[PDB]
Amino acid sequence: MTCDKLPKVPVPPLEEFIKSNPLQFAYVLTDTFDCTTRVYVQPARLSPNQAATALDIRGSRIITNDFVGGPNNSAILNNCTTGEKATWYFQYTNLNTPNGSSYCAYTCNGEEIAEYKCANNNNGTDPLQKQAVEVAKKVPNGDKIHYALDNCPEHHGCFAFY
Amino acid sequence: DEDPMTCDKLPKVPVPPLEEFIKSNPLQFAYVLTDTFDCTTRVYVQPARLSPNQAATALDIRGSRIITNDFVGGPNNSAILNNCTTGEKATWYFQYTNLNTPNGSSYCAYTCNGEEIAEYKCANNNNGTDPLQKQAVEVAKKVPNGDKIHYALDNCPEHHGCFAFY
Amino acid sequence: MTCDKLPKVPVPPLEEFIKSNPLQFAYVLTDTFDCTTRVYVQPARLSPNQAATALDIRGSRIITNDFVGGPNNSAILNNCTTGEKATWYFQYTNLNTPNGSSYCAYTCNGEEIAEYKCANNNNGTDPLQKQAVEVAKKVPNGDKIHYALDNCPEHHGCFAFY
Amino acid sequence: MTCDKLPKVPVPPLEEFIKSNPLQFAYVLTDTFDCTTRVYVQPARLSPNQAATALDIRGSRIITNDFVGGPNNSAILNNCTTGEKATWYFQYTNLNTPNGSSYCAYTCNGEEIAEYKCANNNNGTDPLQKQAVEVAKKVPNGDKIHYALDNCPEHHGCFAFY
Ligand SMILES: [Cl-]
Ligand SMILES: [Cl-]
Ligand SMILES: [Cl-]
Ligand SMILES: [Cl-]
């Protein structure tokens, strides 16, 4: 299995992502996305380009990426701080079941996986997420994929932020 | 016919359903009290599915930094906030809300330290064109400590391809 | 004519200010000092620095700034809520004439005027006041200078406060 | 001893009050007057009734009452925001001694005390002030009279305002 050959399921409607908010990243590749909460945002009313925004929140720090649909079931991201672009895909999505939401998404460096994010709001109980991670961590560079929530900062009264 | 004179006497409109706020996402703060909230984008978040207390969350986003406060409804049309980093509480109210009109959304909210105003946030997604917002800001300025309320969106940092984040 | 080149008359002795109390601001730059009564206060008996205090009173709101003499006929202000300093000067003073008191004072942001206050206790009849306002209105930012006493709140039996 | 029988010393000339400015309230009855600085103002030049004004300043909030002399060594107050009147008296005054100023004033609800204000600019060292407070605390409702200056807000570089 190589990164270019991973499943590319259709990007669900944006409202399906918003109704999942907030999510946590159970498995990620790089350290950057440990202990992280995901919130999706609709394009602003006056947005010229109507891009959505993904928020990756880690304590008092935040990474932001606008995204739009692209070819081959892709999401095309723009880093709001750097203007760097990336092409992402969904390995699967399972949003808004009666047991909540999960998905796994990725971006490729050719055959190797550059970044991986599996999010949920059900504490990792979706059987699809288990299968998906097992598959992804056998692609080249997928050895780096790890459980992301092990030893996270203590909270001060909020459930999904710290 | 006279404007309220102290913070404790400001108007307290019913808190709209959360959905009305989420559908306004994202907003910008046009007027704030402390300069912590200059150049800031607001995003509202529903309670997590597994949340024990069903608190919503307000995100105050300024570049690569974020301030987070959980909130729930309280009596007298209050929102009770819990700072997620410190655990400090505050009782907030809405001076007015005007969400999802044909010209977009605006509101102004505040929290008092007795008769003074401790914090003030006026948000919108229509570049400050709601006439309610103009008159609300004038009123709030006149209460004790309200002279610090200022326009919050001058000279904000340049963007790298996103409209509402930087 | 720019703000840095406006006149700087000697700050009168504090007693002359206190004898003028209370004043109203007839012309100001920002909206903050609309419908406002000025009262000057001597340093507290126990004050270590012996700063005087200017009180700006608008209904139930009070803004307070300690001040002392500085170089070049300046008054150095300390906002009592924030510890922020500002350097002020008098364009002119005309205190305790047989027709009462007036003055115009200002603070600069380099060449533009950041704030302007013209006070009196004679309903704006001092001819010096008219000429000072006409000059200040011509400095950069001075177009915002405006008459400050239109449509002020109704009173409940006191003359200078509401 | 009831409120109606408390001493009524002559109201000193206004200039004595102004020379005492600013004062702090060390003892009060209602907690409105905690952490409060008092400033006296002469009548506005143009005022038709020539009423003086008492300012009660607590941080950024100000209460204002015009006042004139009435019979039996009374001062008749007019709340500038609500138009409400009240007859006040001085239990004693001791202004502008070589150890500074102190006074205690009150207003009655028949035989009970409705409000009490003991002011000074010397941190409570006037022996008259101790005796006066003792006496007032024993009239009906005087049990509410408390020390007004515990745990007041921290300052930002001004001595008498915050
Ligand atoms: Cl993702
Ligand atoms: Cl808010
Ligand atoms: Cl001034
Ligand atoms: Cl008094």
Q: In percent terms, what proportion of residues of chain A is strand?
A: 35-45%
> Which pair of chains forms the biggest interface, and how many residues does each contribute?
A-B, 44 and 45 residues
Could you spell the SSE succession of chain A in H and E letters? Answer: HEEEEEEEEHE
Number of domains of chain A: 1
Instruction: Describe the main β-sheet of chain A briefly.
Output: 8 strands, antiparallel, barrel
Strand order of the largest sheet of chain A: 1-2-3-4-5-6-7-8
Oligomerization state: homotetramer
Content-based structural category of chain A: mainly beta
Distance between the termini of chain A: 37 Å
Helix content percent band of chain A: under 10%
Describe the structure in your own words.
Four copies of one chain form a homotetramer. With 162 residues, chain A is mainly beta. Chain A has one domain. Helix content of chain A is 10%, strand content 42%. Chain A has two helices and nine strands, in the order αββββββββαβ. Chain A has an eight-stranded antiparallel barrel. In chain A, β6 and β7 form a beta hairpin. The N and C termini of chain A lie far apart (37 Å). The interface between A and B is large, with 44 and 45 residues. The complex binds chloride ion (CL) (4 copies). The PDB classes it as lyase. The entry lists the keywords lyase.
